[PDB]
Amino acid sequence: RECKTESNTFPGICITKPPCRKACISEKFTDGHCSKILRRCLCTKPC
Amino acid sequence: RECKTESNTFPGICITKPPCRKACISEKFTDGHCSKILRRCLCTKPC
Ligand SMILES: CCCCCCCC(=O)OC[C@H](COP(=O)(O)O[C@@H]1[C@H](O)[C@H](O)[C@@H](OP(=O)(O)O)[C@H](OP(=O)(O)O)[C@H]1O)OC(=O)CCCCCCC
Ligand SMILES: CCCCCCCC(=O)OC[C@H](COP(=O)(O)O[C@@H]1[C@H](O)[C@H](O)[C@@H](OP(=O)(O)O)[C@H](OP(=O)(O)O)[C@H]1O)OC(=O)CCCCCCC
């Protein structure tokens, strides 16, 4: 499992992963990716 | 926002919140509650 939340800083619609991943790393998470249907940027890190 | 993940220890279908909240506190989260449709026990804590 991972601990997950929505990015505070990622702007725009989440289309591809790397821009979201990078925003999430800037927010002190280890990764990020797009939510499937709503296209939010979700940040993840170890619990 | 909070950081959220699925409980490792909560047994059974999540029907009511307090049993899930208790399991999540035992896993070093600050709260927990039932996922709406799938009835998982989800734990939460500050990011
Ligand atoms: C009956 C409808 C049910 C409503 C409630 C259904 C639940 C709900 O509304 O929230 C999310 C849902 C889909 O969310 P979306 O795909 O954006 O986000 C995913 C969703 O949150 C999953 O639950 C996550 O898995 P988990 O849980 O972390 O394991 C998954 O994380 P990951 O796997 O990507 O890491 C996320 O990507 O959004 C809609 O259904 C909009 C319906 C559009 C219109 C529908 C109706 C007009
Ligand atoms: C257009 C329809 C497509 C989207 C349909 C809806 C698709 C969808 O995303 O549902 C999620 C469902 C499990 O969702 P479930 O309700 O168990 O869990 C919720 C889900 O994780 C939300 O995204 C969370 O909010 P957030 O994101 O953290 O803010 C919410 O957290 P909280 O608020 O409790 O803390 C959780 O309770 O997983 C499936 O998709 C397969 C089931 C299929 C269900 C229906 C399919 C027949």
Author numbering:
A (entry chain C), B (entry chain A): 1 to 47
Please give sentences taken from the publication describing this entry:
NaD1, a plant defensin isolated from the flowers of the ornamental tobacco (Nicotiana alata), exhibits potent antifungal activity against pathogenic fungi, including Fusarium oxysporum, Botrytis cinerea, Aspergillus niger, Cryptococcus species, as well as the yeasts Saccharomyces cerevisiae and Candida albicans. The plant defensins are small (∼5 kDa, 45–54 amino acids), basic, cysteine-rich proteins that display a family-defining disulfide bond array (in a CI–CVIII, CII–CV, CIII–CVI, and CIV–CVII configuration) known as the cysteine-stabilized αβ (CSαβ) motif. This motif consists of a triple-stranded antiparallel β-sheet, which is cross-braced via three disulfide bonds at the core of the molecule to an α-helix (in a βαββ arrangement). NaD1 inhibits fungal growth in a three-stage process that involves specific interaction with the cell wall and entry into the cytoplasm before cell death.
Upon PIP2 binding, NaD1 forms an arch composed of 14 NaD1 molecules, with a final arch diameter of 90 Å and a width of 35 Å. The observed NaD1:PIP2 oligomer can be described as an assembly of seven NaD1 dimers, which comprise two distinct NaD1:NaD1 interfaces. The first interface is formed by an antiparallel alignment of the β1-strand from each of two NaD1 molecules (monomers I and II) and exhibits two-fold symmetry between the associated monomers. It comprises an average buried surface area of 430 Å2 and is formed by a network of six hydrogen bonds involving R1, K4, E6, E27, K45, and C47. NaD1 binds PIP2 primarily via a ‘cationic grip’ that is created by a NaD1 dimer, which results in the formation of a distinct binding site formed by K4 together with residues 33–40, which comprise a characteristic ‘KILRR’ motif. PIP2 forms a dense network of hydrogen bonds involving K4, H33, K36, I37, L38, and R40 of a single NaD1 monomer. Bound PIP2 forms additional hydrogen bonds with R40 from monomer II and K36 from monomer IV′, with the full PIP2 binding site in the oligomer comprising contributions from three different NaD1 molecules. Examination of the PIP2 binding pockets in the NaD1:PIP2 oligomer suggests that R40, which contacts two adjacent PIP2 molecules simultaneously and interacts with the phosphate moiety at position 4, is critical for cooperative binding of PIP2 and therefore formation of the NaD1:PIP2 oligomer.
